[PDB]
């Protein structure tokens, strides 16, 4: 069913979220299980995601091994990411595992290292966000990034492998708040059809 405004629910067992600030328009259509499609037009910032929200009490190791099998028809006109996305609390952390992008490879900082995983190479990045909107109000928090060296819009993302690698370069993780397959748009238009999206925990689908 159709979402065109900030809305936070559950659909076919996947937690979904549509979030946009002021200006432009967006349409998220909710489909089977993890799938969805998105259209956005002249937005500042928009996020469409479908994944799992957590109760905020366990670390990633406790939650188990996570892996995402997805496929997407990704068509950005401008700045947009296709990625696994989410947060930890304590420390507050916003994180991105980016598999494809529009005209600009994020996040424009200095790579701290690389992980090679799922058939490709990812540069790793840490950035700082100072008094910014967050899930826990206006806060100061870090962003962790793994950004693929070349664009890909289907395959497996071994989410936990990334986390291990982040902790290994001393980028510590808090307690799981969310992991989700995300389309994010910045000052762009475009559309994305996420025809496939299965989150597995310990080999266990959703």
**Cβ-count burial 96-122 (b if 16+ within 10 Å, e if not):** bbbbbbbeebbeeeeeeeebebbeeeb
Dihedrals phi, psi of 160, to nearest 5 degrees: -65, -30
Per the annotation, the verdict on 184 as an active-site residue is yes
The active-site residue out of 17, 126, 178, 184 is 184
Structure tokens at 177: 């708040």
Q: How far is CA 119 from CA 23, 34, 122, 165, in A?
A: 38, 23, 10, 16
The active-site residue out of 17, 94, 126, 178 is 94
Specify the experimental method: X-ray
- In the chain, what are the domain boundaries? 1-206
- Within the chain, strands assigned E span 2-3, 7-11, 14-20, 25-30, 36-41, 45-53, 66-89, 93-101, 113-117, 120-132, 139-148, 154-157, 175-201
Cα 39 to Cα 33: distance, rounded to the nearest angstrom: 19
Q: How far is CA 97 from CA 10, 21, 124, 151, in A?
A: 23, 23, 9, 12
CATH topology of domain 1-206: Jelly Rolls (2.60.120)
Per the annotation, the verdict on 126 as an active-site residue is no
Dihedrals phi, psi of 161, to nearest 5 degrees: -60, -45
Structure tokens at 152: 């890909």
Cα 18 to Cα 48: distance, rounded to the nearest angstrom: 5
């Amino acid at each position: 069913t159709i979402v065109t405004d900030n809305s936070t629910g559950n659909h076919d067992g996947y937690d979904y979220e549509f979030w946009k600030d002021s200006g432009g328009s967006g349409t998220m259509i909710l489909n089977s299980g993890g799938t969805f499609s998105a259209s956005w037009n002249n937005v500042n910032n928009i996020l469409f995601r479908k994944g799992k929200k957590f109760n905020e009490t366990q670390t990633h190791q406790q939650v188990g091994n996570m892996s995402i099998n997805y496929g997407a028809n990704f068509q950005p006109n401008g700045n947009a990411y296709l990625c696994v996305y989410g947060w930890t609390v304590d420390p507050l952390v916003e994180y991105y595992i980016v598999d494809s992008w529009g005209n600009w490879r994020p996040p424009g900082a200095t790579p701290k290292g690389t992980i090679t995983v799922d058939g490709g190479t990812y540069d790793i990045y840490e950035t700082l966000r100072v008094n910014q909107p967050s899930i826990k109000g206006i806060a100061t928090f870090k962003q962790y990034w793994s950004v693929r060296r070349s664009k890909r819009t289907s395959g497996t993302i071994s989410v936990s492998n990334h986390f291990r690698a982040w902790e290994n370069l001393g980028m510590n993780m808090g307690k799981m708040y969310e992991v989700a397959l995300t389309v994010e748009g910045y000052q762009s238009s475009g559309s994305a059809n996420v025809y496939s999206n299965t989150l597995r925990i310990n080999g266990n689908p959703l």
